[PDB]
Amino acid sequence: TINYHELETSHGRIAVRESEGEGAPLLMIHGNSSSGAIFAPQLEGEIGKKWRVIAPDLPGHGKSTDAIDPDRSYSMEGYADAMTEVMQQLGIADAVVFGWSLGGHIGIEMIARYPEMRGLMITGTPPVAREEVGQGFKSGPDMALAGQEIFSERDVESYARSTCGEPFEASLLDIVARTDGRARRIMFEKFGSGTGGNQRDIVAEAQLPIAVVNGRDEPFVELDFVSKVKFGNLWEGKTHVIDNAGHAPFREAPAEFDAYLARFIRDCTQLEHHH
Ligand SMILES: CCCC(=O)N[C@@H](CCO)C(=O)O
């Protein structure tokens, strides 16, 4: 059973899905124009059966309302504020965080806001300073849509297919079509302007374990760039790459992805801790 409920937050009404796992909590943060529903394989599978998986919808996304104040909410740092508020309301201070793409950038901005975070895993996310956006991401037509407010029908399909990978289904179009397009435009502009904390410096200086897991056929992220990013505490000492997966290995290759995620959660929550 996945438990669905809604929170009244300062950002708006936020939808939250939780598994019934008895173990340590995992906050999973979805990507641009997606929804926590995308994490069905984890919510409903072995990960969610053991651990308390929490998969909200960002303001403007999924089953959440649009933001009360788009100018406050629709940015990497604004979303980080919102997720921190969600975790406050849920009464959970020590989650492991998994962030997918935009969600990974949000997770990076959460490091300063959510001090008892036990670890952060980022997938589809190159930590970049504002001037490095061109280096960390692959230029292309779908990448261009990340910051585009108005999507045509073909835009919705192209973006959904490229972000979610195989297998595709119609429900994904519904998720992407719902997204408040203002959120795309404002977030991307603010990202390029560096309105939040410099993510390159944040990950270099962060002491908590940071895990990096990507699909080899990533269409958005430059894996060469990612493999050169300095992390304060890179989990297992390297960035990880999964064959036969692209931007969304958690759904494209769930068993292989789950091996990494489960091991990371175990390492961050059930190993003896020494400074
Ligand atoms: C570029 C800002 C972060 C972002 O929107 N990432 C996208 C991938 C690129 O289209 C995502 O969240 O999937």
Residue numbers in the entry: 2 to 276
Verbatim from the authors:
The crystal structure of wild-type AidH complexed with the product C4-HS (AidH–C4-HS) was determined at 1.09 Å resolution. Following the lactone-bond breakage of N-butanoyl homoserine lactone (C4-HSL), the reaction product C4-HS features newly formed hydroxyl and carboxyl groups. The C4-­HS contains the O atom derived from the water molecule. The new carboxyl group forms hydrogen bonds to Ser102 and His248. In addition, the new hydroxyl group shows a rotation of approximately 98° around the axis of the C—C bond, resulting in a stretched conformation, and perfectly stabilizes this conformation by forming a hydrogen bond to Tyr160, which shifts by 1.3 Å compared with the substrate–enzyme complex. Tyr160 clutches the substrate and the product at the active site and positions them in the correct conformation via hydrogen bonds. In addition to the catalytic triad residues, Tyr160 is suggested to play a key role in catalysis. The entrance to the substrate-binding tunnel is in the open state upon substrate or product binding. Moreover, the size of the entrance varies with different substrate acyl-chain lengths.
